[PDB]
């Protein structure tokens, strides 16, 4: 059904440019930094359009502007999509593999692996101590787990492990996991990870669930749960699922003030029944929560910093190879 | 099994157009203007490169399974004669369109063929053009050739036309055309032609020297059908090979063979010594023009 919430510009090279006639150019802007620019001339009927995608240290800009025989140069096209660009010239990317380097850069922000935690909340529980020290798995809890994904043994598991021990049994003997759209999701199920005699704060469970960004909190009974309940550097958004037996799952979302709105909108009477609709809703909602969390104080810096270094590497390589294309040595 | 037009002329469209490719150009102090097309293409396991090098008379095509080489070397791999300072890149968003047209220009979309009727013994021009009436066997072959109709091909009461690959072809049936001093009104059409069919009711020698035409180079002789081919030492082999029992079964498979052969006959005679000057003259001229356009628009996308 509906597209996953990554930066919507990361798709454009793939849907519109790759495999099709187009041009890439580079240039260095004193303010904007390294520029990597893609442009592509398109025709439908007698309607000549122009699709532009300019990459900066910070953003990539996109637009499709009608052109009409009544033809711009690259500097000028650049200015049509990013007003601030101000550069004497652009340079043609002549390296026959640029487009493969480029798409990878563009897509560096779509992630294919996800790891989410699953905590079970007892009726009274209000502490990490109570929240992780839980051994018995509820009937409702099993039934929900069967629903999230498939149970897998970790011993020789070839899928995405999300940090679990795949070869020595030291992080439980099983987990729940699943292939989603084309993603791999490993769950960190609190009750499936090892329990420790005398370690109330249960490190062997927290070291995984505490390093996740998004978790599901399953409840058998309605109980309060705020993020202030768990001390974590990573946990940012939570999806609470409560099983009113009466077989409806009552669903809610909490996440720090930091994280913006995400995922499929919760339905209006906000309750689901066990089935595909819910599988779809919940899984996309978890992925959307994670993409939303990446906008918060904690991660934004690291993201920026990363985009910048990838772009520079990209720019430098499009530059080195274009040079070797025109006449480095012959 | 395709039509004998220059094979390297279908390639830009089949492989380059609409896919990621690069076009450069240059000024060979020996081969004049140049227009180079190159394309990288990963065939799963192994990576193959494709080249299309244009000169003022030849285009050179080649396909290298490479293991990464610079621009010139890519050129030097298809035409060893290249010797430039540096290739320049086309940056004109509207270039591939100009390039396929140039590449495609030697593909004749139109054909005009002639039908001469040799009455047994007719040996001179005045005679083989004199024939005003049509014999039963000639009409039975003419209605077989294509369909009767009232692409003109440059008149009279009627003539024959037929569609083949998509190309239109009008015939000039001497007899079906107006009768006037040495039949100038039949030579106007059949003369300016290049391939003609000679139909005969009975066998008689036919030889191209029997008609004074600077243009006609080849004839497919059909004798009520015993098909033979006659053409100048100038013109190479063409169309599908002729069959072992040289005869031709009247019908679907025959017409097919014939129409292709006539076409291929023309493309053949276009390789002749009289059809050099116009081929070099046109190709060069067209290239010179395309090089200018490629240059002015590319400079424009940047500097001048």
UniProtKB/Swiss-Prot annotation, chain A:
Query: Effect of altering residue 211 to A/K?
Result: Abolishes GTPase activation
Q: What induces it?
A: By 12-O-tetradecanoylphorbol-13-acetate (TPA) in promyelocytic HL-60 cells.
Reported effect of changing residue 94 to E?
Impaired dimerization
> Changing residue 207 to A: reported impact?
Reduces GTPase activation
Boundaries of every Rap-GAP domain copy: 102-314
Q: What does the entry state regarding organ or tissue expression?
A: Significant expression seen in the brain, kidney and pancreas. Abundant in the cerebral cortex and expressed at much lower levels in the spinal cord. Not detected in the lymphoid tissues.
UniProt-annotated location(s): Golgi apparatus membrane
Entry coiled-coil feature ranges? none
Outcome after substituting residue 208 to A: Abolishes GTPase activation
Functionally, this protein is described as follows:
GTPase activator for the nuclear Ras-related regulatory protein RAP-1A (KREV-1), converting it to the putatively inactive GDP-bound state.
Q: How does it assemble?
A: Homodimer and heterodimer with RAP1B.
Q: What is this protein called?
A: Rap1 GTPase-activating protein 1
Q: Which organism is it from?
A: Homo sapiens (Human)
Specify first residue, last residue and whole-protein length for the fragment.
78 to 413 of 663
């Amino acid at each position: 059904k509906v597209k996953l919430e990554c930066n919507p510009t990361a798709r454009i090279y793939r849907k519109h440019f790759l495999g099709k006639e187009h041009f890439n150019y580079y240039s260095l802007d004193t303010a904007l930094g390294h520029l990597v620019f893609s442009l592509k001339y398109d025709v439908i009927g007698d309607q000549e359009h122009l699709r532009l995608l300019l990459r900066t240290k910070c953003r990539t800009y996109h637009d499709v502007i009608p052109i009409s025989c009544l033809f711009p140069n690259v500097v000028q096209m650049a200015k049509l999509v990013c007003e601030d660009v101000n550069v004497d010239r652009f340079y043609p990317v002549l390296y026959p593999k640029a487009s493969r380097l480029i798409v990878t850069f563009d897509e560096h922000v779509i992630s294919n692996n996800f790891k989410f935690g699953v905590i079970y909340q007892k009726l009274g529980q209000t502490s990490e101590e109570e929240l992780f020290s839980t051994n018995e798995e509820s009937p409702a809890f099993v039934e929900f787990l069967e629903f999230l994904g498939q149970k897998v043994k970790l011993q020789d598991f070839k899928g995405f492990r999300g940090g679990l021990d795949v070869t020595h049994g030291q992080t439980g003997t099983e987990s729940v996991y699943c292939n989603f759209r084309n993603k791999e999701i490993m769950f960190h199920v609190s009750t499936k990870l090892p329990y420790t005699e005398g370690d109330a704060q249960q490190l062997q469970r927290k070291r995984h669930i505490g390093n996740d960004i998004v978790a599901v909190v399953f409840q058998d009974e309605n109980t309060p749960f705020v993020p202030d309940m768990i001390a974590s550097n990573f946990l940012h958004a939570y999806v609470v699922v409560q099983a009113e037996g009466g077989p409806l799952y009552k669903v809610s979302v909490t996440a720090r003030d930091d994280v913006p709105f995400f995922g499929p909108p919760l339905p209006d009477p906000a309750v689901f029944r066990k089935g595909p609709e819910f599988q779809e809703f919940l899984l996309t909602k978890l992925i959307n929560a994670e993409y939303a969390c990446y906008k918060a104080e904690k991660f934004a810096k690291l993201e920026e910093r990363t985009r910048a270094a990838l772009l520079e590497t990209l720019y430098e390589e499009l530059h080195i190879h274009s040079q070797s294309m025109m006449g480095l040595g012959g």
